[PDB]
Design goal:
Chain lengths: ~220, ~220
């Protein structure tokens, strides 16, 4: 029923990270309605396959290769949803479950067509941005500006330097997303803007602020 | 790569029968680029599953259930091709290979949408009628009129009775499709017309002729 089990585990990791939930084996098990033991065995095989690493505190860390694939699966999934909703007219309650199968069989060529054919490929019908469209191709720690890449990762805030800021509007944004020193947050450059996420709340940083906030790896 | 192997074997049986080729294990092996031994093992499992029977002369006979599924797979396959060609604009050289994956994951609901959304669902872009649209839901031997059903089957012509016919135009049609007594031909009611096929040449019978031609089971 899962069609491509490996790809489903990756897509589920992806969407847990999007939501700011720590990707743990029991959350994957719950989301895919699979047994914990079955998940643990499939996770072991994904490790052998180069797709994931189980960190010492048991969270799943997608390898850059795993992440690239997960991003591809998500992109296909969201473009299929837009197709099914925008063009096919499939009833909305069935769209995600259809795209959940289609995502494992859509080629890159179909996607490049969809990008031309659809009105807007900013987001799925369910509110989330479509990732990967670029790859389809149509002083403790480190300053956020230097540490962020085009692939998101979870890091820890070790300093904010509010004393050096002129752009003072984002202070409250950070506070309302409860981002403080010691918060573990996702970072990405996407761009020319860095974004911090905490608990699925996004803060798009101005560059003065991205120069000032310093992070450490988890 | 086959996505649903069982469904691929059925779709390949279907298309061999369409072409008037006897569905034999070596022709399936050849078409799917699978080993003979692998085909024979998968065929054994399909038998255990109720989908096919290997007749005493080694041809594959789809069970009515196998045939119903094969017809469903074909319908999904052809509607996907029309979608990919008519709406998506996928380059024609890639359409069949894409639909070859999509056919195993399209629900009935998507198909019912496609039937409304597409211009014409008479045929795939590759010239063959789309079957199953009805089930989607939007004196030796026996006279052809009595023996034919909505599901095609291979039978043997045992009598033609040309002496009793007034409609004399179809005689040559039969002759050019080399349908003579002793010819093994496919029959279907589809309708209100019976069709005889021999070697992938179709003859649509007038009812006077369908009353006259008598057939036996193989
Ligand atoms: Ni979805
Ligand atoms: Ni899926
Ligand atoms: Ni085809
Ligand atoms: Ni296929």
């Amino acid at each position: 029923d899962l069609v491509d089990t490996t790809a489903m585990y990756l897509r589920t990791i992806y969407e847990l990270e999007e939501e700011g939930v720590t990707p743990l084996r029991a959350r994957i098990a719950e989301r895919l309605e699979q047994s914990g033991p079955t998940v643990s065995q499939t996770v072991a095989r994904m490790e052998r396959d180069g797709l994931v690493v189980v960190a010492s505190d048991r969270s799943l860390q997608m390898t850059p290769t795993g992440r690239t694939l997960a991003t591809a699966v998500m992109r296909k999934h969201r473009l299929a949803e837009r197709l099914l909703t925008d063009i096919i007219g499939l009833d909305i309650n069935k769209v995600h479950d259809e795209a959940d199968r289609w995502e494992h069989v859509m080629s890159d060529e179909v996607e490049r067509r969809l990008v031309k054919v659809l009105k807007d490929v900013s987001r799925s019908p369910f509110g989330n941005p479509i990732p990967g469209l670029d790859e389809l191709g149509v002083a403790p720690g480190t300053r956020v500006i230097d540490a962020a890449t085009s692939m998101p990762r979870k890091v820890r805030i070790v300093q904010i330097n509010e004393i050096f800021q002129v752009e003072t509007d984002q202070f409250t944004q950070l506070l309302d997303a409860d981002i403080r020193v010691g918060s573990e947050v996702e970072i990405v450059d996407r761009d020319g803007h860095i974004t911090l996420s905490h608990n699925g709340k996004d803060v798009e940083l101005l560059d003065d602020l991205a120069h000032t906030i310093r992070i450490e790896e988890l």
